[PDB]
Design a protein around this nucleic acid. Structure first.
Lengths: 88, 138, 234, 150
RNA sequence: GCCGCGGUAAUACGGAGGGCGCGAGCGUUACCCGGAUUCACUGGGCGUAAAGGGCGUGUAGGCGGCCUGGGGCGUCCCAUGUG
RNA sequence: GGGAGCAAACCGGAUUAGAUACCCGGGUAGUCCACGCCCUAAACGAUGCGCGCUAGGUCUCUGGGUCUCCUGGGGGCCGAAGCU
């Protein structure tokens, strides 16, 4: 899966400030990481549907967040979405 | 997640009562206490008071019931045999001054929110106003 | 005098097979059993006897009942030793509620009680000599304490209510003050004068039933010593 | 002894070898006309017997109808099983506007003016017991605040 | 009119005596509202009576916790025009 | 592509008045796999989802604790009030 070690790298990379174990920026960055991972997966196990479902959720959840973000603040929205390179 | 907190308060009350309980704790809400104050200022409950369930501020609401009864089902009659919200979030209910309800041929009440405070089927009428027909008790 | 007696060995009963209603009368759960709060017990005893007394002094009859073995006998005593009707055997259905009709048997009792001593015994075949004689054995077997007054009670005292809740019911439909010694395996609500306390250990039963009859008599004149309580009392 | 007018009488039936056996149900109302009405449903092998029992059972079951000026104290809706019923007090000299049942009962109730309506199942028996619980649930400005003393 | 009636004793058909109703009218057919809380805002429902979508994800839309302040569109009051 | 067993259809044998069946002996597609369609059902708890409120008892799967007990999640039974 994802090493605690790698998972952190992400977190430490998006934390709006030292510490910051949660938050939008993060929750998103994280979901993403999981998504692609899971993506690449199913891109191999088309037959693995149940897991597909999980993607969607992960997928929507991210939608949600960004939406809040975009709403609350556009600035760091463009920022995040940009750095993660999303919304295609 | 509670859509209409008020309708809840009533229900919490409408349930605690149906079983004969000392007091019930409805979650803190200025506007809620109003329906409470009025609820008591009209003699439907012993009264109430603020509390806190671990940083969680609620409102103890003491229920008033009747005298024990003679015969089967010696269950004491209740002060509130009926409370039901009117204006719901799914359908706001507004009334003009001439439209205010006449709860239980006068024996009843009809709390409601007005531009100038929270009044009842008489009070508001006396003030000659109108507003969101919050509900009705009796 | 009171406390000590009770505190002696006459409180705390049924365990884990209770009724939440009766949660107002109970101190704690020691090693399993529910330890009823005597402190409160007392308070209730009061109002109860108050009533009893406020009735025992106005020419009112009471009906006691206890159809459980671990409390039969005694109830038989305390009743005769007070002239207060009672039920020790099978509490027939519709007694209070169908008195007029149950009475019909009481009358049938004497109907025989009289034919018992008579010259008509010279005749009559063995068929009936056995029929009647037997028909009386049982007849007399159930009404031994349900005769006295040919008028409904002004109240009724009882051991385990729920055990005889049926009587209770009858009582309640006919509007009749209900008083009784109930433990944790019963619901108060439908009990007017509640004597909270053990309903099986004859120890508590005797006591609470004893001081009850005395009190029934204190309002009549003739204060004496207790009644035959011990004979095999543990 | 009061007015004693019977709502309805019927002939039920049961099955058994050789044939069906009958019985009769009589529903009766008994009111003085001052605020006391009783509702007794009597069943027995024969019309008369039924009737009577209804009366007896009735008297044994009555209720204090808190009249007022000749009408009810306030409006009331009472659902009893399939049946439902509305009761609205009308100004004096109005009439007792209700169906056979609520009437027969309300007439002896003592009311002279009351607006009504049977809702849901119109079954006699049930509307009958329905009407009762209706009355049996009425209130006066007195016994109203009599409760909200405090 | 709905329920139903007539198979050789029909209060249901046809005549008669009688009776009830309304009356210069009385009936019939047609159509609208009612009763019908039987499209249900007032005022209904879906476990077995007709009625939960095979399940999920989610767009629009509908609905929304607690506290303080600004605006005042909804809402409410007064006056006036109008009707 | 694969094919042992079973098995609509099919053929025999019986049963029966008949037996296009139930029972018996055989038997193909299918049932299997890959990839792609079809998208139905007594697709049932015949009970939409989310949240709040309203006695307990019992046994059971699983998590935590200063572990005869307390507390969290799920599945069953019996049942307060109340509903029908």
């Amino acid at each position: 899966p994802i090493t605690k070690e790698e998972k952190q790298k992400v977190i430490q990379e998006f934390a709006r400030f030292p510490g910051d174990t949660g938050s939008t920026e993060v929750q998103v960055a994280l979901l993403t990481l999981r998504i692609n991972r899971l993506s690449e997966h199913l891109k191999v196990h088309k037959k693995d549907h149940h897991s597909h479902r999980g993607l969607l959720m992960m997928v929507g959840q991210r939608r949600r967040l960004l939406r809040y973000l975009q709403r609350e603040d556009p600035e760091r929205y463009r920022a995040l979405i940009e750095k993660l390179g999303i919304r295609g | 997640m509670l859509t209409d907190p008020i309708a809840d308060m009533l229900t919490r009350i409408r349930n605690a009562t149906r079983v004969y309980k000392e007091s019930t704790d409805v979650p803190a809400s200025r506007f809620k206490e109003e329906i409470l104050r009025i609820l008591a200022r009209e003699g439907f409950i012993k009264g109430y008071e603020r509390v806190d369930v671990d940083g969680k501020p609620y409102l103890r609401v003491y229920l008033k019931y009747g005298p024990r009864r003679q015969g089967p089902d010696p269950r004491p009659e209740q002060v509130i045999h009926h409370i039901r919200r009117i204006s719901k979030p799914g359908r706001r209910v507004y009334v003009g001054v001439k439209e205010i309800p006449r709860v239980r041929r006068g024996l009843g009440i009809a709390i409601l929110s007005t531009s100038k405070g929270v009044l009842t089927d008489r009070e508001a009428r006396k003030l000659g106003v109108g507003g969101e027909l919050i509900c009705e008790v009796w | 005098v009171k406390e000590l007696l009770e505190a002696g060995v006459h409180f705390g009963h049924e365990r884990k097979r209770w009724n939440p209603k009766f949660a107002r009368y109970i101190y704690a759960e020691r090693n399993g059993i529910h330890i009823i709060d005597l402190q409160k017990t007392m308070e209730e005893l009061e109002r109860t006897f108050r009533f009893i007394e406020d009735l025992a002094m106005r020419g009112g009859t009471i009906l006691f009942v206890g159809t459980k073995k671990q409390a039969q006998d005694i109830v038989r005593m305390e009743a005769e030793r007070a002239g207060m009707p009672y039920v020790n055997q099978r509490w027939l259905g519709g007694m209070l509620t169908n008195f007029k009709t149950i009475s019909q048997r009481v009358h049938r009792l004497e109907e025989l009680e009289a034919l018992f001593a008579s010259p008509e015994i010279e005749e009559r075949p063995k068929k009936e000599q056995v029929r009647l004689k037997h028909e009386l054995e049982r007849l007399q077997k159930y009404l031994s304490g349900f005769r006295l007054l040919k008028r409904l009670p002004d109240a009724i005292f009882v051991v385990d209510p729920t055990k005889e809740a049926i009587a209770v019911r009858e009582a309640r439909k006919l509007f009749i003050p209900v008083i009784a010694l109930a433990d944790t395996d019963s619901d108060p609500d439908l009990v007017d004068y509640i004597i909270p306390g053990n309903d099986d250990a004859i120890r508590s039963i005797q006591l609470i039933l004893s001081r009850a009859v005395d009190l029934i008599i204190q309002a009549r004149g003739g204060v004496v010593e207790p009644s035959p309580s011990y004979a095999l009392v543990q | 002894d009061f007015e004693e007018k019977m709502i309805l009488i019927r002939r039920t039936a049961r099955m058994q070898a050789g044939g069906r056996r009958f019985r009769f149900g009589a529903l009766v109302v008994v009111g003085d006309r001052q605020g006391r009405v009783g509702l007794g449903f009597g069943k027995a092998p024969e019309v008369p017997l039924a009737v009577q029992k209804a009366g007896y059972y009735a008297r044994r079951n009555m209720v204090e109808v808190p009249l007022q000026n000749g009408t009810i104290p306030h409006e009331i809706e009472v659902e009893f099983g399939a049946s439902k019923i509305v009761l609205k007090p009308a100004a004096p000299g109005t009439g007792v506007i209700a169906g056979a049942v609520p009437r027969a009962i309300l007439e002896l109730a003592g009311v002279t003016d009351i607006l009504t309506k049977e809702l849901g199942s119109r079954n006699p028996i049930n509307i009958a017991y329905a009407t009762m619980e209706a009355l049996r649930q009425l209130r006066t400005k007195a016994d109203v605040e009599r409760l909200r003393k405090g």
